[PDB]
């Protein structure tokens, strides 16, 4: 709706004016403000050799319903499944509050990518590898970044 | 149908000379089916509707015995006869004309022709009374003004003997118990409910059809003014109390209770 679009327009303006220095090249079609795309530029290793394109799809009832975030770039992370869906508690429906801003959501996801949370995984096998043999996990994550990751800006 | 239409088209030649040969033939072939058979009656119904020619009462005794579907008590045999007579409109008006033809005061055997014309139409409507439409669709007649006949001087009480003899015929369909309920006079209606205990033991839903039939029958009668209708309605309600308290609330099974409550409220009103 137009009500959703003016708020998303204002949030995007504020984000683009302040900057974040780690989420860049945000591209949004003006005719449909409910879908955003952008580039995750992580700071921490073992993920710092690449960048990861994401797409954010906002429901028309936002902010009364939470946004959904999907990943378009393959990533080797225990909290992110093979279809690019991610579990972010701050935007889960039962935890969601309307005051939450998109920049807080992005900072939370970047934090989660930079420091995985094995205790609540989407890929339990990756979580197990992280727990019982960190060396293997780090190895796999670096090689996976090299093989499928995007080129950094 | 076709070659008999050209047979009547191609024909001192009086019109009774056509009917005399047909009457002689039906009197000839009534005898081998009298002891030792529906196709003869349907053929002679086509032939004498195709004559436009008055039937005798005694030949109404014969053609109706040629039509009563004896030994056809399974419904699989009724589904086997449906594709011969697949069009549901010509046979329905023909049978309805036969119904209106026998409606003069002989009128006893015509209740057995109804199981033929109750299988070539819709199923039994289960709705509440005064919702569907009046009496001709519920009974399933739809061309018969029976309401001067349940409310008259009932000089012809031979229908109750005729219905006494043939109870197993109530197993062949679902319209026929309702239509037999809508032909009986009031003073012999308690005996009609008394004669049908075992059919209600077979299926404990047709007492809702009894409630609907009495709620159809009462307002057609005007205000009650004598002791005779009081005695008659008292006997019918006592037989109704009997048929309620014999069985169980297994009468009320599969959520039929709401319709019984609405029908007894309409009957009270």
């Amino acid at each position: 709706s137009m009500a959703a679009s003016r708020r998303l327009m204002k949030e995007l303006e504020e984000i683009r004016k302040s900057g974040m220095k780690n989420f860049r090249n945000i591209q949004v079609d003006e005719a449909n403000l409910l879908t955003w795309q952008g580039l995750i530029v992580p700071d921490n290793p073992p993920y710092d050799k690449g960048a990861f394109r994401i797409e954010i799809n906002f429901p028309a009832e936002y902010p009364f319903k939470p946004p959904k975030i999907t990943f378009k770039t393959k990533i080797y992370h225990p909290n992110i499944d093979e279809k690019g869906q991610v579990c972010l508690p701050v935007i889960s429906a039962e935890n969601w509050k309307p005051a939450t801003k998109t920049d807080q959501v992005i900072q939370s996801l970047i934090a989660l990518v930079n420091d995985p949370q094995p205790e609540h995984p989407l890929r339990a096998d990756l979580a197990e590898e992280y727990s019982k043999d960190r060396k293997k996990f780090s190895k796999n994550a670096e090689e996976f970044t090299k093989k499928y990751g995007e080129k950094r800006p | 149908m076709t070659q008999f239409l050209q047979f009547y088209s191609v024909v001192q030649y009086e019109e009774k000379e056509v009917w005399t040969n047909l009457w002689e033939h039906v009197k000839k072939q009534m005898a081998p089916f009298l002891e030792g058979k529906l196709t003869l009656g349907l053929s002679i119904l086509f032939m004498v509707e195709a004559a436009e020619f008055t039937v005798p009462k005694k030949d109404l005794d014969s053609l109706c015995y040629l039509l009563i579907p004896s030994a056809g008590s399974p419904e699989a045999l009724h589904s086997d006869l449906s594709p011969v007579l697949r069009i549901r409109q010509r046979w329905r008006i023909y049978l309805t004309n036969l119904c209106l033809r026998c409606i003069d005061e002989r009128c006893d055997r015509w209740l057995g022709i109804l199981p033929l014309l109750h299988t070539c139409m819709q199923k039994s409507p289960p709705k509440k009374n005064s919702k569907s439409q009046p009496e001709d669709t519920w009974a399933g007649l739809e061309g018969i003004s029976f309401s001067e006949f349940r409310d008259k001087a009932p000089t012809r009480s031979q229908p109750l003997q005729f219905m006494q003899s043939k109870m197993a015929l109530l197993r062949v369909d679902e319209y026929l118990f309702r239509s037999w309920l809508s032909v009986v006079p009031l003073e012999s209606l308690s005996s009609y409910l008394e004669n049908s205990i075992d059919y209600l033991s077979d299926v404990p839903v047709r007492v809702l059809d009894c409630l609907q039939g009495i709620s159809y029958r009462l307002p057609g009668l005007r205000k009650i003014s004598n002791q005779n209708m009081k005695k008659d309605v008292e006997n019918v309600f006592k037989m109704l109390m009997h048929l309620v308290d014999i069985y169980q609330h297994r009468i009320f099974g599969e959520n039929l209770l709401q319709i019984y409550l609405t029908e007894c409220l309409t009957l009270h009103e």
Partner: protein, 409 residues
């Protein structure tokens, strides 16, 4: 009765009835128009509007009587149910105003569903027009004065649906297009099941002449019958095939008039169903005899819109639509003449797109399954279409085999 001024009640309920209606959200929003129409013709001045009041009050009678058999007899007593309703009493002030608000809130969704069933696509404006002759209003107040022919079921924010997917302010020329069309297609299914495909037209027209709509339309004289027939042609064609023009609809209506006249020229001389050639069911007979030769013609005007301009000369140079269905063949001629006129000017590529889109219909037309039988003039025109299409398609094969190759390498 005189127990309540029913006319004032209906005129009060009109606005709340119309304010619940919605169309398909762009399909000629007519809320104030329906308000103006209904308030202009719910009066007692003209005997037209007085008779419309008597039958509309009879429709409210039968629909509320069927509506209140479901009630539990403690809601049939509406005065007693309303005196016990404290909030509606103290919301409506006095007691008689509360009762009138109660009857208004009962009648208003019933009136809304009834207007949503009559005004299906514009059937009301045929009364809102002036200078409309007696067949229009007489058939409109024949169909609306029949309960069994015109069922009005009931339901709350009611949707009124369009059927003719119409333009700006259509007002369908037969007073009910959809009920007569669905009734005639029911008669079609019963007619093609009862008899065989030799006396099908005879049995179909006779089973139409039996019904009370048929014996109502039979008492019209010849001129009103023919005018209703052309009106039913235009709106039936708008019902079946979605047509995105005005003058393409004129050519398609002349084409179906040619089909109906051809089919009436097929039988020699019965002259018992040709005492009604200006009758409704011929239209359906023509479509059910000629459906592919119409539908293909619609597609050859839908892929190629410009060719209609060439058809805008065709009836001016041949005087067609007199005997046989020829507009498919003349549209074939116009498309082949436009392709034979130029040979090179936009590009080879867009022409390849155009010839591959027109490959199937133009080859389908010049086939003996399509042209089953007709007059010798149609066969001569189809032979010329065959020759000119062979020329155009052989040149197209040459282009797509060598010319785009040497434009590529």
């Amino acid at each position: 009765s005189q127990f309540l001024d029913t006319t004032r009640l209906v005129q009060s309920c009109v606005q709340g009835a119309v304010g619940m209606l919605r169309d398909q959200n762009e399909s000629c929003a007519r809320n104030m128009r329906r308000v103006t129409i209904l308030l202009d013709l719910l009066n007692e001045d003209n005997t037209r509007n007085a008779s419309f009041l008597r039958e509309s009050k009879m429709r409210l009678h039968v629909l509320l009587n069927k509506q209140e058999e479901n009630q539990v007899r403690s809601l049939k007593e509406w005065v007693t149910r309303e005196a016990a309703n404290q909030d509606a009493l103290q919301e409506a002030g006095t007691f008689r105003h509360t009762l009138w608000k109660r009857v208004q809130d009962v009648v208003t969704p019933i009136l809304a569903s009834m207007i949503a069933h009559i005004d299906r696509d514009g059937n009301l404006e045929l009364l809102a027009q002036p200078d409309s002759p007696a067949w229009v209003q007489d058939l409109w107040m024949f169909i609306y004065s029949d309960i069994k022919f015109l069922n009005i079921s009931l339901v709350s924010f009611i949707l009124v649906q369009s059927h003719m997917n119409l333009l700006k302010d259509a007002y369908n020329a037969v007073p009910f297009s959809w009920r007569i069309r669905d009734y005639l297609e029911e008669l079609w299914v019963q007619a093609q099941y009862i008899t065989d495909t030799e006396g099908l037209s005879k049995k179909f027209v006779e089973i139409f002449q039996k019904t009370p709509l048929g014996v109502f339309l039979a008492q019209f004289p010849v001129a009103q019958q023919q005018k209703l027939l052309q009106s039913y042609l235009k709106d039936f064609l708008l019902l079946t095939m979605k047509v995105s023009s005005r003058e393409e609809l004129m050519f398609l209506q002349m084409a179906l008039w040619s089909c109906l006249r051809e089919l009436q020229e097929a039988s020699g001389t019965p002259d018992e169903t040709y005492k009604f050639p200006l009758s409704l069911p011929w239209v359906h007979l023509a479509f059910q005899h000629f459906r592919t030769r119409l539908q293909n013609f619609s597609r050859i005007l839908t892929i190629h819109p410009q060719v209609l301009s060439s058809l805008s000369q065709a009836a001016e140079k041949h005087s067609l639509a007199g005997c046989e269905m020829t507009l498919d063949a003349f549209a074939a001629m116009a498309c082949a003449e436009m392709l034979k006129g130029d040979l090179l000017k936009p590009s080879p590529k867009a022409w390849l797109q155009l010839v591959k889109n027109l490959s199937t219909p133009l080859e389908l037309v010049c086939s003996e399954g399509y042209l089953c039988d007709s007059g010798s003039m149609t066969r001569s025109v189809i032979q010329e279409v065959r020759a000119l299409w062979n020329r155009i398609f052989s040149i197209a094969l040459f282009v797509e085999h060598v010319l785009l190759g040497t434009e590529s390498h």
